[PDB]
Scaffold this motif. Structure first.
Motif, PDB file in Angstrom:
ATOM      1  N   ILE A  41      30.134  96.416  68.176  1.00  0.00           N
ATOM      2  CA  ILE A  41      29.106  95.147  67.962  1.00  0.00           C
ATOM      3  C   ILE A  41      29.308  95.308  66.814  1.00  0.00           C
ATOM      4  O   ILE A  41      29.062  94.094  66.546  1.00  0.00           O
ATOM      5  N   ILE A  42      29.369  96.017  66.186  1.00  0.00           N
ATOM      6  CA  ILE A  42      28.847  96.545  64.338  1.00  0.00           C
ATOM      7  C   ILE A  42      29.647  97.124  64.216  1.00  0.00           C
ATOM      8  O   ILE A  42      30.117  98.033  64.725  1.00  0.00           O
ATOM      9  N   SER A  43      30.461  96.852  62.794  1.00  0.00           N
ATOM     10  CA  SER A  43      31.171  97.888  61.762  1.00  0.00           C
ATOM     11  C   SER A  43      30.574  98.354  60.700  1.00  0.00           C
ATOM     12  O   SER A  43      29.755  97.807  60.383  1.00  0.00           O
ATOM     13  N   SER A  44      30.445  99.583  59.954  1.00  0.00           N
ATOM     14  CA  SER A  44      29.916  99.694  58.687  1.00  0.00           C
ATOM     15  C   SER A  44      31.234  99.587  58.120  1.00  0.00           C
ATOM     16  O   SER A  44      32.360 100.018  58.192  1.00  0.00           O
ATOM     17  N   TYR A  45      30.506  99.473  56.072  1.00  0.00           N
ATOM     18  CA  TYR A  45      31.523  99.897  54.834  1.00  0.00           C
ATOM     19  C   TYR A  45      29.857 100.520  54.099  1.00  0.00           C
ATOM     20  O   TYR A  45      28.893 100.452  53.928  1.00  0.00           O
ATOM     21  N   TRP A  46      31.167 101.828  53.092  1.00  0.00           N
ATOM     22  CA  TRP A  46      29.927 101.794  52.362  1.00  0.00           C
ATOM     23  C   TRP A  46      30.825 101.312  50.984  1.00  0.00           C
ATOM     24  O   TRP A  46      31.753 100.322  50.149  1.00  0.00           O
ATOM     25  N   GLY A  47      28.991 100.723  49.832  1.00  0.00           N
ATOM     26  CA  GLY A  47      29.123 100.127  49.172  1.00  0.00           C
ATOM     27  C   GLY A  47      28.171 100.277  47.987  1.00  0.00           C
ATOM     28  O   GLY A  47      27.698 102.235  48.018  1.00  0.00           O
ATOM     29  N   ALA A  65      17.891  93.523  70.123  1.00  0.00           N
ATOM     30  CA  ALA A  65      17.506  91.756  69.460  1.00  0.00           C
ATOM     31  C   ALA A  65      17.650  91.063  68.036  1.00  0.00           C
ATOM     32  O   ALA A  65      18.212  91.015  67.496  1.00  0.00           O
ATOM     33  N   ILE A  66      16.769  92.081  67.869  1.00  0.00           N
ATOM     34  CA  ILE A  66      16.194  91.832  66.005  1.00  0.00           C
ATOM     35  C   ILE A  66      17.260  92.695  65.287  1.00  0.00           C
ATOM     36  O   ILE A  66      17.623  91.308  64.334  1.00  0.00           O
ATOM     37  N   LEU A  67      17.869  93.385  65.625  1.00  0.00           N
ATOM     38  CA  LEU A  67      19.155  94.068  65.114  1.00  0.00           C
ATOM     39  C   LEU A  67      20.314  93.475  64.562  1.00  0.00           C
ATOM     40  O   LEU A  67      20.890  92.432  63.444  1.00  0.00           O
ATOM     41  N   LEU A  68      20.471  92.677  66.183  1.00  0.00           N
ATOM     42  CA  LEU A  68      22.079  91.521  65.660  1.00  0.00           C
ATOM     43  C   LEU A  68      21.361  90.426  65.424  1.00  0.00           C
ATOM     44  O   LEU A  68      22.339  90.152  64.299  1.00  0.00           O
ATOM     45  N   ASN A  69      20.445  90.033  65.131  1.00  0.00           N
ATOM     46  CA  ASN A  69      20.367  88.847  64.714  1.00  0.00           C
ATOM     47  C   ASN A  69      19.773  89.271  63.281  1.00  0.00           C
ATOM     48  O   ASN A  69      20.651  88.336  62.794  1.00  0.00           O
ATOM     49  N   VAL A  70      19.885  89.676  62.754  1.00  0.00           N
ATOM     50  CA  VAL A  70      19.794  90.395  61.251  1.00  0.00           C
ATOM     51  C   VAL A  70      21.068  90.576  60.528  1.00  0.00           C
ATOM     52  O   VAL A  70      21.720  89.516  59.435  1.00  0.00           O
ATOM     53  N   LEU A  71      21.921  90.810  61.776  1.00  0.00           N
ATOM     54  CA  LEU A  71      23.152  91.303  60.920  1.00  0.00           C
ATOM     55  C   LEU A  71      23.747  90.096  61.111  1.00  0.00           C
ATOM     56  O   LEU A  71      24.996  89.805  60.138  1.00  0.00           O
ATOM     57  N   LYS A  72      23.737  88.942  62.003  1.00  0.00           N
ATOM     58  CA  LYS A  72      24.247  87.614  62.372  1.00  0.00           C
ATOM     59  C   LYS A  72      23.693  87.200  61.221  1.00  0.00           C
ATOM     60  O   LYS A  72      24.668  86.085  60.533  1.00  0.00           O
ATOM     61  N   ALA A 108      32.720  93.323  74.400  1.00  0.00           N
ATOM     62  CA  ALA A 108      30.842  92.290  74.024  1.00  0.00           C
ATOM     63  C   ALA A 108      31.093  92.093  75.291  1.00  0.00           C
ATOM     64  O   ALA A 108      29.240  91.060  75.501  1.00  0.00           O
ATOM     65  N   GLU A 109      31.174  92.239  76.575  1.00  0.00           N
ATOM     66  CA  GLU A 109      30.289  92.460  78.163  1.00  0.00           C
ATOM     67  C   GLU A 109      28.721  92.707  78.273  1.00  0.00           C
ATOM     68  O   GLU A 109      28.782  93.479  76.821  1.00  0.00           O
ATOM     69  N   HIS A 149      29.441  88.914  67.290  1.00  0.00           N
ATOM     70  CA  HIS A 149      28.796  87.510  68.091  1.00  0.00           C
ATOM     71  C   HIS A 149      29.214  87.215  69.254  1.00  0.00           C
ATOM     72  O   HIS A 149      28.609  86.432  70.039  1.00  0.00           O
ATOM     73  N   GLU A 150      30.580  87.680  70.157  1.00  0.00           N
ATOM     74  CA  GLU A 150      31.001  87.174  71.638  1.00  0.00           C
ATOM     75  C   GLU A 150      29.611  87.890  72.506  1.00  0.00           C
ATOM     76  O   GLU A 150      29.020  86.959  73.420  1.00  0.00           O
ATOM     77  N   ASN A 151      28.864  88.620  71.869  1.00  0.00           N
ATOM     78  CA  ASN A 151      28.173  90.055  72.644  1.00  0.00           C
ATOM     79  C   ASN A 151      26.931  89.357  73.226  1.00  0.00           C
ATOM     80  O   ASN A 151      25.804  88.653  74.003  1.00  0.00           O
ATOM     81  N   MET A 152      26.601  87.984  71.773  1.00  0.00           N
ATOM     82  CA  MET A 152      25.005  87.534  71.503  1.00  0.00           C
ATOM     83  C   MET A 152      25.544  86.253  72.142  1.00  0.00           C
ATOM     84  O   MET A 152      24.697  85.470  73.136  1.00  0.00           O
TER      85      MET A 152
END
Ligand SMILES: [Cu+2]
Ligand SMILES: [Cu+2]
Lengths: 112, 113
Positions: free
Chosen positions: A60-66, A13-20, B2-3, A84-87
């Protein structure tokens, strides 16, 4: 105890809301959560990586290099539209579950 | 995709069942009936799913069972004193978790200014 299933659900829950709130990298997430909790919540780095592997698997998440322009290479994470839909689905299903329990309390009451 | 993942579906079902038992000792058919009515006929849990979940909860000391009196004799389930304490610990930790995210949102907002 708080069982292990629930601790992981809290960390998820914490990780998704941080990335949100914005793209981020792991050490920055840990730092930001520690700051938002006045040093009280020190997320376990090992635990983030297993959750991140799962969330990437589910799209649910993706990544990229910076940060390559300096000569380094840091991995950043982003909440995807699937994420976003999962949340939204988690909020909506939990509201449905909670409404069932509220209804039960009432039905118990009105019988009295 | 997403489910809702299996972990959260299990957590939601656990939540429902323990909250039914928080409101009073009960037996499987009576729990299923009550949830069916509180969900306006839409959620009719299968007795097998309750037996699966209750087996685990009983093993972990969160609930226990005992027989009622009598043309049958129902098996009642009850939240244990550990089970009650676990609910309070859960409420308290999830409240802390939620406030941490609330703080991050606030910090995010006020920084933008
Ligand atoms: Cu939430
Ligand atoms: Cu609850």
């Amino acid at each position: 105890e708080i069982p292990k299933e629930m601790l992981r659900a809290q960390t998820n829950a914490i990780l998704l809301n941080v990335l949100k709130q914005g793209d981020n990298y792991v050490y920055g997430i840990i730092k930001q959560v520690k700051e938002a909790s006045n040093g009280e919540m020190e997320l376990n780095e090992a635990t983030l990586y297993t959750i991140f592997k799962r969330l990437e698997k589910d799209g649910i998440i993706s990544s990229y290099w910076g940060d390559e322009s300096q000569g380094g290479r840091r991995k950043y994470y982003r909440l995807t539209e699937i994420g976003h839909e999962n949340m939204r689905l988690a909020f909506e299903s939990w509201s449905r579950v909670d409404k069932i329990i509220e209804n039960l309390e009432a039905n118990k009451k009105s019988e009295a």
